[PDB]
């Protein structure tokens, strides 16, 4: 009892009903995958300028 092996028929009709939705942009993307050495120091750099702008309201 053989039967059809495979086809992509009808598959891009289905994809296009609800979709091919564009990639979803964001300001401020994640640091996921970013160099720890960079990111460790960056954690302190920001904490530094955050502490700055606090003593800028006193």
């Amino acid at each position: 009892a053989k039967s059809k092996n495979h086809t992509a028929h009808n598959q891009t009709r289905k994809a296009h009903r609800n979709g091919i939705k564009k990639p979803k942009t964001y300001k401020y993307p994640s640091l996921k995958g970013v160099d720890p050495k960079f990111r460790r120091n960056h954690k302190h750099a920001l904490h530094g300028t955050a502490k700055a702008l606090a003593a800028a309201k006193k």
């Binding site: 289905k14 994809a15 296009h16 609800n18 979709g19 091919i20 939705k21 564009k22 990639p23 979803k24 993307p29 995958g33 970013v34 160099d35 960079f38």
Partner: peptide
């Protein structure tokens, strides 16, 4: 490029699988 290392740069690419990216 999302990141920079000794010999390399990380790149992000939108690859579309199924009906989404």
């Amino acid at each position: 490029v999302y990141n920079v290392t000794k010999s390399s740069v990380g790149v992000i690419i939108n690859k579309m699988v199924g009906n989404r990216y």
